[PDB]
Design a protein around this nucleic acid. Structure first.
Ligand SMILES: Nc1nc2c(ncn2[C@@H]2O[C@H](COP(=O)(O)OP(=O)(O)OP(=O)(O)O)[C@@H](O)[C@H]2O)c(=O)[nH]1
Ligand SMILES: [Mg+2]
Ligand SMILES: [Zn+2]
Ligand SMILES: [Zn+2]
Lengths: 277, 1350, 49, 49, 79
DNA sequence: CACGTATGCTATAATGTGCAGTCTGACGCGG
DNA sequence: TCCGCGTCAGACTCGTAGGATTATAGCATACGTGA
């Protein structure tokens, strides 16, 4: 038994009849007029066309099956917007919609980071131009060389070629052998080591010790501002909500608490020692 | 955070939605420009949470000032970024999809449950054909497949009143509508009608599936996925490399596939698309889901841009690379270093040289903490900068911290527990670790570029674990055999050998010395050699009846050297131990003696002293390697020319067409094998005792002082086979095939090999080397399986209070006692009361550890055989008692409760195999005088006048004056005995004689030879010579045989002069010997024979190197409990044997016992010949047919002790062949784990009923409650299981999945709704908790009582 | 020494404070295992005490 | 392995019978493989790729 | 004690319990600053705990005794 | 409006696809 | 029940080094939020 998704689908499309021009006009007249059967038979008859055009747009992003579905969707738009009265054949018209829809879908799904169509198409013209340049310049083209050919800013080219960088799989093994990959080396810079986490504990606890070594009205406005002891991290003007109810006297008392604490760090042995980190 | 147990069950669509915090409806990861997550994308922050701690995306809410706030603008909750690894999402599937694990992972589960073949389901799934869900019209039945055209026929005719559907929808609806209850009872009713063997297995299987399904609360619908869960972003990360590049998990590409096709399907449904296109999209959706779950399962795995298969979810759990094996049972570990190792001979046994810069970095936080206590460092940042600057004061602090702090040294590979040992570190300037020489043995560490790993025990508990349990001084004895592993090697042995060994007179022969100190004074002064014979006076200290030592002064005749070594010797040991010329073998006995008399401290210091003096004298000796040291035999060229004329004689006899190619091959190989022995013997007599030029009187003989010989004889280095290719002849080399080449090696290394000899050497060499790299995988895999099956076993109790054990005997294999009874029962809890031979007084107590004392007494009383308490016979449930195990071989005393024995056992069995990775038995010569005693023997006298044996397993004993077994041999089939049964023989007499390269078929009756079923071409072939024409007939087997003569058995029938058959004396059996395949026959049809003539000669090709490449598969097949290819037949029950009826030669057996009077019949193949002769009182398990024994049959008929002892002995045969000591108790551990499960045949008072297989522990605990309550008792039968299946049979599914077969294990557990309450070590190691054993047993039992009391 | 994120920092602080106290928790790899199993569509939940 | 032809045989494929099945293999530099092989019943078979 | 632990093991018996008992005692000296019985002779808390066990001064049962003694006297003081 | 992202049309006829390289002994499961 | 395709594992730590590739027409009008 053939269980291949592809082979099964291609079997089913084969068993629908190819249409002639007069048949296409007859069906399509009723199809625009809303005939469930007409649209279906035109679709089912012309699926084979979709697949033939789907075998040229491979090795680019998605697989044949994927392309075959987007192609089908293009053919559906073509059946909806076909003009039977116009002498022009259907296959000619459908080809445009199928190629269009396939190209456009391979431009949004082909890249892990969704690049907008417009950036992608801009970049594409830069690429095709680079190919012509390389065909007569023997050597591949520089950023300025591409920019010189299009009469455009070098920064435009640089930024457009800076969005072409591809994604590397985290799980892809290094050295060929399936052992340690980029995940086994890639260090989390968001998660710090116990050395750094413990330094923060020591730092935060240090201040507290010398925070209760100052004045009673110097550590009741300095901490209630930073949100160290208090509940909410206020600003100079917001400390008035507590009891201070001042704007200049709060700013004088904040900095007076800081200045006596600067001398507490200079005597214990920090100041410039704890400045580097 | 701390839970008790873990459950797996089927994920309901609704359950999947519970975990999800949002539906992903877009393939978008992040924006190209602002690298921020895209709306409803795979990395959506609106779903999975904030990228930065307490920060919304658009940045409206920052810091803890806004705690639980949900930004109206961007729609992101302001919380910890930690949540992005925690929160899951989901996808709504437009068409349902099969869960590949519960479809393709066998058993089918979805197919088994619907009773629908897998092919049938798939044809439905890929929309090839319709399946009927309910045909109300019984005209069409349930689950019947209809093709596209079959559906069109019934559609007009019946229609409406039949519902048949297609794809996942159909199967899900079929699953949903199926009533498990009703079908369960229906199938139980069908089970009763006519239950054939395989029908009843499949029916019981579906019964257990239905019962488990209702008990799990799983519903069949859930096999089909309507909702698809999404793994958290940080568990499938998209991270930016330094270079502006991005790198992502493959899961994100697979997720993108699924989403694109699913959303396209939603579109095609909104657009009312024609059905063929709908179908293709539904197939595409199932393909992408299947790729996402388990990629390379269903067909072609979906590859990416790397042209490699995209790592699927299943792949991250599955195999070595999977979560269990790589990240959960083993880890990268902080406070770890590695460097080259080199010798530290100055080190004491408890020490290791630790590089300064290495130690400075390993103990960083301890230095910062001490720096703040001294007030040298103001803060941590200042401490950091002070250590970066490496200030003078920082070294003095580091010195302070590392004192009394143990560090772990580890060497790869870690095969046994001693691969890791703790030392006190000694800081050294220089980047290499210095290792103590005496423990190099444990590590197998040679400094040819070896590196080691350093680990810092951080906690006080870990430090004490290192100092007490893992310290090198505390771990001397191998846990595998009761032998000290810490034993001088190499230079050390050579030095002590040099000192002790004597020379003729030399400087100061026959001097008289006051103390060993005067001797040292004399030697170093240069008026005495170390080898001078001298009458010194040394005072030895012998232990008395109590702990008090009795000293005794006496004048012995020893060398100066021996006197000086006595100074190293502790007081308490005898002088006679050092008074011999010391080798590696004597020095180990020295250490053993020291350990048993003095104890740990004295042995540790003594071992160090021995190392120092050993090296010291080795260097003084100035020993070296000259070209004159390699002495060759003066008679090489003669022996070789002779052996060469001999081989030429057999080549000439071949050219004459008489001797076959195979016979010449064997005889040429035998000539050269003997030539090799003779040349080696010649070299070694010429070398060993070559010092025949002495003085004093005249010409005297003494041992040669050749450096090379000394090295071999001391056992420092080299051997007798190493000197063969150093002065004698290289010998024969065997190919990478295993086979030996016809042309061997004649020249040695000294003489120098040519282009041909060297090229020929290569094959065997490279085969050896490739074996090392490739086979260690298989040895290690066996270690792994062993360890996995013995994991859980721990010492649980002190005394099980059982009377049970196994009666052991002395192994007398050959002429030298391979394993004595004393050594096989040393430190084993004796059972019952085992006294001396004369039964009239007790000798040993019931519950008593076997000490060296009681073992010595056993030998003086000559105890034959003794019941000893074993692990297998322990009654302790969920472990074993200290009594049933006996001595911890590594400790030298009774095992401590809590010690993890199983792991030790599996490591001990596995390591030797992993590390380790002349058959001319013509005639037995008896050596001591005795009466010949045969057993299991049926012989017959021949024409010549010689007792020829016609039984396969004949044994030959050697009975002394009083009547006990001294020597034992294996006499094979068709062997010629010198004297029969009961006759006396003298010493050095050939008692038995036979041809080794042949297995003869010998007759029991006289007359003429008849050819039956020996047609030329079909069964046999024919080949003639010349002038006269001697033709030989060669029997073809099923390999070289046509389809014509397949059921024809070829046999040489015996007949008389008339032409009639000749009955075998005392049986109704016409004489007919069936010849097997490749059997060469010299006598043709119509030839007269007497009784004892050889009818045919079966070839015996097996010229392998054995080694460890052909023994381990035997051991693995034993531990995996594989029934052999032609298993022997055994009596099931005791009684009287009766022969009955025959189906054209096929033997029926109508056996009628005494009490069980009902007859029992058994069919036997026609050509299989029985060794026993009917009409006999048969014990359960009397061998009837020649062949290997299946461990299952052994257990089923002769019970546990029988099968345990079969495996122990058959395994031990292999390791003993290689000179590997492993105690039986380790193999007995693993055996016990093999006998874990038991099948209940007949209902109890619980819900066991017929055929359930449960742990024997749990059914015995049930039987304790039945004994008290009465009710219906449970009848059961113990079952044997192979290691792999036994490990999978443990109730713990975490243990099962971590081992192997992970996809299948988790489907089985998920469908059963299994809950693991975590009792084993594996399971606790995985969750990163405290081991339930060793140190952890205290805490873990304290938890168990907290659990028992709420 | 390995995954336990709370444990390693807390342990570090204990070492600098001299007290070699063991303050362990759960390895982060196990948490991941569970999430990976549920992403496979197998419900694996922890029954608490 | 050189393009050309090659005659091989698994010495006892089915370990039950132990019958030597001879096979031929045509290896091109570019194209499909052409295999000829015996079965136990001594019937000649052809397989492509 | 430092080099060889055998005599210390022979006092308690169970190696595993020796480790637990010496760890609990070493934690007392490490954190509580509980005073040593044996002269430290410049040794770490770990070594002191093992020496104390070798001479037979520290014991699981004795530790539990002094635990309730001091805890009960503090309960007496509270009430 | 601009800037980013999307939807759309053009009409000679064209209508079934196209990479695999074999390892080995063992243990189960439908024909 | 036998021949036969399918599944299942196949030692433990070290290491060296990054990674590279392809290509999606050209233009006019349409839809969603900041300045
Ligand atoms: N795990 C592992 N170990 C290896 C490998 N190759 C060599 N070794 C080890 O390195 C050592 C090299 O052989 P030696 O150690 O010299 O052999 P030996 O036991 O000293 O025996 P003699 O040479 O007779 O003295 C062995 O102990 C091996 O265990 C390998 O590929 N894997
Ligand atoms: Mg080495
Ligand atoms: Zn926001
Ligand atoms: Zn017991």
């Amino acid at each position: 038994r053939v269980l291949d998704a592809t082979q099964l689908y291609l079997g089913e499309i084969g068993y629908s009849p190819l249409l002639t021009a007069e048949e296409e006009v007859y069906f399509a007249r009723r199809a625009l007029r809303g005939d469930v059967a007409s649209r279906r038979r035109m679709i089912e008859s012309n699926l084979r066309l979709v697949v033939k055009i789907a075998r040229r747009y491979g090795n680019r992003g998605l697989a044949l099956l994927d392309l075959i579905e987007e192609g089908n969707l293009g053919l559906i738009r073509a059946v909806e917007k076909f003009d039977p009265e116009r002498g022009f054949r259907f296959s000619t018209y459908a080809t445009w919609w199928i190629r269009q829809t396939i190209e456009r879908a391979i431009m949004n799904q082909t890249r892990t980071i969704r690049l907008p169509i417009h950036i992608v198409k801009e970049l594409n013209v830069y690429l095709r131009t680079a190919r012509e340049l390389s065909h007569k310049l023997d050597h591949e083209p520089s950023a300025e060389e591409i920019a010189e050919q299009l009469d455009k800013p070098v920064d435009d080219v640089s930024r457009m070629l800076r969005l072409n960088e591809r994604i590397t799989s985290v799980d892809t093994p290094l050295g060929g052998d399936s052992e340690k990959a980029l995940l086994d080396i890639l260090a989390d810079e968001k998660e710090n080591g116990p050395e750094d986490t413990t330094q923060d504990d020591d730092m935060k606890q240090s201040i507290v010790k010398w925070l209760f070594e100052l004045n009673a009205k110097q550590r009741e406005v300095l901490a209630r501002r930073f949100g160290l002891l208090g509940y909410e991290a206020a600003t100079l003007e917001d400390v008035g909500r507590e009891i201070g109810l001042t704007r200049e006297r709060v700013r004088q008392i904040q900095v007076e608490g800081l200045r006596r604490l600067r001398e507490i760090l200079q005597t214990q042995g920090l100041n410039i020692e704890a400045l580097f980190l | 955070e701390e839970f008790d147990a873990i459950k797996i069950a089927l994920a309901s669509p609704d359950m999947i939605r519970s975990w999800s915090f949002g539906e992903v409806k877009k393939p978008e990861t992040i924006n190209y420009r602002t690298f921020k997550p895209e709306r409803d994308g795979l990395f959506c922050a609106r779903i999975f949470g904030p990228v930065k701690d307490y920060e919304c995306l658009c940045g409206k809410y920052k810091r803890l000032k806004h705690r639980g706030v949900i930004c109206e603008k961007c729609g992101v909750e302001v919380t910890q970024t930690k949540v992005r690894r925690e929160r899951m999402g989901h996808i709504e599937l437009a068409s349902p999809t099969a869960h590949i694990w519960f479809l393709k992972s066998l058993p089918s589960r979805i197919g088994l449950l619907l009773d629908m073949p897998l092919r049938d389901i798939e044809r439905v799934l890929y929309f090839e054909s319709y399946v009927v869900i309910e045909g109300g019209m019984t005209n069409l039945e349930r689950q019947q497949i209809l093709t596209e055209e079959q559906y069109l026929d019934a559609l007009e005719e019946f229609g409406d009143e039949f519902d048949a559907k297609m794809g996942a929808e159909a199967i899900q609806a079929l699953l949903k509508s199926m009533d498990l209850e009703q079908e369960c009872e229906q199938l139980r009713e069908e089970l009763n009608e006519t239950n054939s063997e395989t029908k009843r297995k499949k029916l019981t299987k579906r019964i257990k599936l239905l019962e488990a399904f209702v008990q799990s609360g799983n519903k069949p619908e859930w096999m089909i996925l309507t909702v698809l869960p999404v793994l958290p972003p940080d568990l499938r990360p998209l991270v930016p490399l330094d270079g502006g590049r991005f790198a992502t998990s493959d899961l994100n590409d697979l997720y993108r596939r699924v989403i694109n096709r699913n959303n396209r399907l939603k579109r095609l449904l909104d657009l009312a698309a024609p059905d063929i296109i709908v179908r293709n999209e539904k197939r595409m959706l199932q393909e992408a889901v299947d790729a996402l779950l388990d990629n390379g399962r269903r067909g072609r795995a979906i590859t990416g841009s790397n042209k490699r298969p995209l790592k699927s979810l299943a792949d991250m759990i599955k195999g070595k690379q999977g979560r269990f094996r790589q990240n959960l049972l083993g880890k990268r570990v902080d406070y770890s270093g590695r460097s080259v190792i080199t010798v530290g001979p100055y080190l004491r046994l408890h020490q290791c040289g630790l590089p300064k810069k290495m130690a400075l970095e390993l103990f960083k936080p301890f230095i910062y903490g001490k720096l703040e206590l001294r007030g040298l460092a103001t803060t941590i940042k200042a401490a950091k900068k002070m250590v970066e600057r490496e200030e003078a004061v920082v070294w003095d602090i580091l010195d302070e911290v590392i004192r009394e702090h143990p560090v772990l040294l580890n060497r790869a590979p870690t095969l046994h527990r001693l691969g890791i040992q703790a030392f006190e570190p000694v800081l050294i300037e220089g980047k290499a670790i210095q290792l103590h020489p005496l423990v190099c043995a444990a590590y197998n560490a040679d400094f040819d570029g070896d590196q080691m790993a350093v680990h810092v025990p951080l906690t006080l508990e870990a430090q004490l674990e290192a100092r007490a349990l893992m310290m090198s001084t505390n771990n001397i004895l191998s846990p595998a055999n009761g032998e000290p592993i810490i034993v001088p090697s190499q230079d050390v042995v050579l030095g002590l050998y040099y000192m002790t060994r004597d020379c003729v007179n030399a400087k100061g022969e026959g001097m008289v010395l006051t103390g060993p100190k005067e001797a040292e004074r004399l030697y170093r002064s240069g008026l005495a050699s170390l080898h001078a014979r001298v009458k010194v006076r040394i005072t030895e200290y012998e232990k008395d009846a109590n702990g008090e030592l009795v000293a005794k002064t006496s004048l012995k005749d020893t060398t100066v050297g021996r006197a000086i070594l006595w100074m190293i010797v502790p007081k308490g040991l005898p002088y006679s131990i050092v008074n011999q010329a010391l080798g590696k073998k004597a020095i180990s006995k020295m250490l053993n003696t020291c350990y048993r008399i003095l104890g740990l401290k004295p042995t540790v210091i003594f071992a160090d002293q021995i190392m120092y003096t050993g090296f010291a004298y080795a260097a003084r000796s100035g020993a070296s390697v000259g070209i004159d040291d390699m002495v060759i035999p003066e008679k090489k060229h003669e022996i070789i020319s002779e052996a060469e004329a001999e081989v030429a004689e057999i080549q000439e006899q071949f050219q004459s067409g008489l001797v076959t190619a195979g016979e010449r091959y064997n005889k040429v190989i035998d000539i050269w094998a003997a030539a090799n022995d003779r040349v080696s013997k010649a070299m070694m007599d010429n070398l060993q005792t070559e010092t025949v030029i002495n003085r004093d009187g005249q010409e005297e003989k003494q041992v040669s002082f050749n450096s090379i010989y000394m090295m071999a004889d001391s056992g420092a280095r080299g051997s007798a086979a190493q000197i063969r290719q150093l002065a004698g002849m290289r010998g024969l080399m065997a190919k990478p095939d295993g086979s030996i080449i016809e042309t061997p090696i004649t020249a040695n290394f000294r003489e120098g090999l040519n282009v041909l000899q060297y090229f020929i050497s290569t094959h065997g060499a490279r085969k050896g080397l490739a074996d090392t790299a490739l086979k260690t995988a298989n040895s290690g895999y066996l270690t792994r399986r062993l360890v996995d099956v013995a994991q859980d076993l721990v010492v649980t109790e002190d005394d099980c209070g059982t009377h049970e054990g196994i009666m052991m005997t002395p192994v007398i294999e050959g002429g030298d006692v391979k394993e004595p009874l004393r050594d096989r029962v040393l430190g084993r809890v004796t059972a019952e009361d085992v006294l001396k031979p004369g039964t009239a007084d007790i000798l040993v107590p019931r519950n008593t550890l076997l000490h060296e004392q009681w073992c010595d007494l056993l030998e003086e009383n000559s105890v034959d055989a003794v019941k000893v308490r074993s692990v297998v016979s322990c009654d302790t449930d969920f472990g074993v008692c200290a009594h049933c195990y006996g001595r911890d071989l590594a400790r030298g005393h009774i095992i401590n409760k809590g010690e993890a024995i199983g792991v030790i056992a599996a490591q001990s069995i596995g390591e030797p195999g992993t590390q380790l990775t002349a058959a001319a038995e013509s005639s037995i010569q008896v050596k001591n005088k005795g009466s010949i005693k045969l057993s299991n023997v049926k012989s017959v006298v021949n024409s010549s006048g010689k007792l020829v044996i016609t039984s396969r397993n004949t044994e030959l004993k050697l009975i002394d004056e009083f009547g006990r077994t001294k020597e034992s041999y294996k006499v094979p089939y068709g062997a010629v005995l010198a004297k029969g049964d009961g006759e006396q023989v003298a010493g050095g007499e050939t008692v038995a004689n036979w041809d080794p390269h042949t297995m003869p078929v010998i007759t029991e009756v006289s007359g003429f030879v008849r050819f039956t079923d020996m047609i030329d071409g079909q069964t046999i072939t024919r080949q003639t010579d010349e002038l006269t024409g001697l033709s030989s007939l060669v029997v073809l087997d099923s390999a070289e045989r046509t389809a014509g003569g397949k059921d024809l058995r070829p046999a040489l029938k015996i007949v008389d002069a008339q032409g009639n058959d000749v009955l075998i004396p005392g049986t109704d059996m016409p004489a007919q010997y069936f010849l097997p395949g490749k059997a060469i026959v010299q006598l043709e049809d119509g030839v007269q024979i007497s009784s004892g003539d050889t009818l045919a000669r079966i070839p015996q090709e097996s010229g392998g190197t054995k080694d460890i490449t052909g023994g381990l598969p035997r051991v693995a097949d034993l531990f995996e409990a594989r029934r052999p290819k032609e298993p022997a037949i055994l009596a099931e029950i005791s009684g009287i044997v009766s022969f009955g009826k025959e189906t054209k030669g096929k033997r029926r057996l109508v056996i009628t016992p005494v009490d069980g009077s009902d007859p029992y019949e058994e069919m036997i193949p026609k050509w299989r010949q029985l060794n026993v002769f009917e009409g006999e009182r048969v014990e359960r398990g009397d061998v009837i047919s020649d062949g290997p024994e299946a461990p299952h049959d052994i257990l089923r008929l002769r019970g546990v002790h029988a099968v345990t002892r079969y495996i122990v002995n058959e395994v031990q045969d292999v390791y003993r062949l290689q000179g590997v000591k492993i105690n039986d108790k380790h193999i007995e551990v693993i055996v016990r784990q093999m006998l874990r499960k038991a099948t209940i045949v007949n209902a109890g008072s619980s819900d066991f009923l017929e055929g359930e297989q449960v742990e024997y522990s749990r059914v015995k605990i049930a039987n304790r409650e039945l004994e008290a309550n009465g009710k219906v008792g449970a009848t059961y039968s113990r079952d044997l299981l192979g290691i792999t299946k036994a490990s999978l049979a443990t109730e713990s599914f975490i243990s099962a999945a971590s081992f192997q077969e992970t996809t299948r294990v988790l489907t089985e557990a998920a469908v059963a709704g299994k809950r693991d309450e975590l009792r084993g070590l594996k399971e606790n190691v995985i969750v990163g908790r405290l081991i339930p054993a060793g140190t952890g047993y205290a805490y873990h039992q304290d938890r168990m009582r907290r659990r028992a009391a709420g | 020494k390995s995954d336990d994120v709370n444990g390693r920092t807390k342990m570090y602080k204990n070492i600098v404070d001299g007290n070699h106290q063991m303050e362990p928790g759960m390895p982060e790899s196990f948490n991941v295992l569970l999430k990976e199993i549920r992403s496979l569509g197998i419900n694996i939940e922890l029954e608490d005490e | 392995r050189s393009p050309g032809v090659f005659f091989d045989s698994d010495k006892g494929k089915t370990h039950s019978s132990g019958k030597v099945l001879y096979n031929a293999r045509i290896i091109p530099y570019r194209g499909s493989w052409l295999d000829f092989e015996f079965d136990p019943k001594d019937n000649l078979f052809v397989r492509i790729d | 004690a430092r080099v060889t632990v055998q005599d210390a093991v022979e006092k308690i018996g169970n190696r595993f319990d020796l480790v637990l008992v010496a760890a609990r005692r070493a934690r007392q000296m490490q954190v509580g600053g509980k005073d040593p019985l044996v002269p430290e002779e410049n040794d770490k808390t770990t070594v002191i705990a093992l020496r104390e066990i070798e001479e037979g001064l520290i014991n699981n049962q004795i530790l539990d005794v002094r635990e309730r003694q001091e805890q009960q006297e503090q309960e007496a003081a509270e009430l």
